[PDB]
Amino acid sequence: AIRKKLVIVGDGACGKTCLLIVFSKDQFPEVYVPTVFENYVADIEVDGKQVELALWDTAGQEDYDRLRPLSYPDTDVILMCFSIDSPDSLENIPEKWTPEVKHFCPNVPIILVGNKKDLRNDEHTRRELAKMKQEPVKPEEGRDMANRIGAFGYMECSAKTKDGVREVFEMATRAALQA
Amino acid sequence: SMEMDEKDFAADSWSLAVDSSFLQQHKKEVMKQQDVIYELIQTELHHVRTLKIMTRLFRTGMLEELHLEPGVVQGLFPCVDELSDIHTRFLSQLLERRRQALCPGSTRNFVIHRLGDLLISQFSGPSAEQMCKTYSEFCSRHSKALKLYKELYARDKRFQQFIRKVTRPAVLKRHGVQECILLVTQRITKYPLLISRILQHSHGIEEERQDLTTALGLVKELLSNVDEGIYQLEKGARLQEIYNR
Ligand SMILES: CS(=O)(=O)c1cccc2cccnc12
Ligand SMILES: CS(=O)(=O)c1cccc2cccnc12
Questions:
Q1: Which of A44, A92, A101, B194 is in the most buried spot, having the most CB atoms within 10 Å?
Q2: How far is B75 from A84, CA to CA, in rounded Å?
Q3: For domain A3-177, is the CATH number 3.40.50.300?
Q4: Contact predicate A165/A111, CB 8 Å
């Protein structure tokens, strides 16, 4: 098996920690949802190729511009996350997260991931966002942002229900394997 | 880690670690607070374990088996003895607070009501100055350590055999040399996340809410100071590249 490194980036409320927890356990924890994620090395076989995929979170590093880049050396694939219940998290993608990742991880594929897709049809979410003249992120808004920033692709998932989680990490593995 | 502590922190949560008859005696808010305190101690136990892999398995193994040039082992593992001393002491204090809180006749049933004071002590005075000095030095030597490791692995046969030998066991799957270095660099930024969540469930006693609020502020001050004191060292960097930063 070949070893590859994945790092997830995004705002504090984007759901990146929960996404790594749910993938690494293949389960949304029923008793206790961890506050933090240390690291994990997943055994993944995608399109007949075996990979050891090391997983890392940048949660807690958002306010520390000299500590945060220490997470980037030798990254093979970036998951760049935003929450579908937060159009504000999508707005910070192009001029904050994208120039940083392009600088520290040149030529590394970026997959833009819309997290918490289950909240797109949540009535409480729609009511709260409508108070700030907002609505949940539409799929075309996610795809257009991914297209604009030069992302390898656009994907959505829900850590809560596990829908789309396996597909995100299998695609990230394929991206990490490309020349 | 030692077996006694590994077993005490084997469960996924405090609610699964204690006896169910003891769990049933507490309110939901107490269970939520104890589950996050348990995660802080459990992740601190694992962080001290990462430092023991670095000092005992890697560093000491290279000194005792390999013929590396002087200053190479220190370059791969900067500040590891100082980091081990800071966190082993902090872990000792957390584990003693848990041990004092055990019910008589039990080695697993406890409630920690007063964590705030322990965190203020850890993140103030000489211990905070030592944490700041040590992480500012370690994090500034992080890139150099990774580059030195990659160079040795690619060019030295005995070094490659040593690494492949000691990292072969499944229990070392997440703990290669580069993985250990990044686990240590990321530890300090996990503290505000854990402390904020403990504070969310610690409103029952006003002195505890105040103490955890003070501790959270001290941890953020330490992180801000470390972040401002970092400049990556690079082997072969010339003075002109440095003064033109
Ligand atoms: C980590 S940061 O937010 O300070 C940052 C962002 C984008 C580009 C950068 C280029 C050099 C250094 N820092 C950069
Ligand atoms: C006696 S044991 O090793 O099975 C054990 C250990 C830790 C926690 C436990 C909780 C409930 C029951 N048993 C527990």
A1: B194
A2: 44
A3: yes
A4: no
Cβ separation B15–A38 shorter than 8 A: no
Decide: residue A126, CB within 10 A, 0-12 exposed, 13-18 middle, 19+ buried: middle
- Nearest Cα neighbor of A118 from A38, A35, A22, A42 is A22
Q: Using a 6 Å cutoff on CB, does residue B151 contact ligand 2?
A: no
Long-range contacts of B214-219 (CB under 8 A, 24+ apart): B214/B116, B214/B120, B215/B116, B215/B119, B215/B120, B215/B123, B216/B192, B218/B119, B218/B120, B218/B123, B218/B124, B218/B128, B219/B119, B219/B123, B219/B191, B219/B192, B219/B195
Its sign, for the CA torsion B189, B142, A18, A103, is: positive
Angle B131-B174-A72 from CA coordinates, rounded to 5°? 65
Q: Is A65 in the pocket of ligand 1 (CB under 6 A)?
A: yes
What are the structure tokens assigned to A142, written together? 């996610």
Cβ of B189 and A40 within 8 Å?
no
Of A36, A40, A41, the CB nearest to B190: A36
CA distance A96 to A116: 21
**Ligand whose nearest atom lies closest to the CA of A105:** 1
CA dist A80 to A43, A115, A153, B34, B160, Å? 22, 10, 11, 33, 34
Determine whether the interchain pair B146/A73 forms a contact, defined as Cβ–Cβ distance below 8 Å. yes
CA nearest to B36, candidates A35, A140, A71, A100: A35
CA A40 – CA B79 distance, rounded (Å): 25
Q: Does B68 touch chain A (CB under 8 A)?
A: no
The tokens for A25 are: 């356990």
Q: What approach was used to elucidate this structure?
A: X-ray
Kindly report each contact of residues A153-157 with a partner whose C-beta sits within 8 Å and lies 24 or more positions away, as own/partner: A153/A111, A153/A112, A154/A111, A154/A112, A154/A113, A154/A114, A155/A111, A155/A112, A155/A113, A155/A114, A156/A84, A156/A113, A156/A114, A156/A115, A156/A117, A157/A19, A157/A113, A157/A114, A157/A115, A157/A117
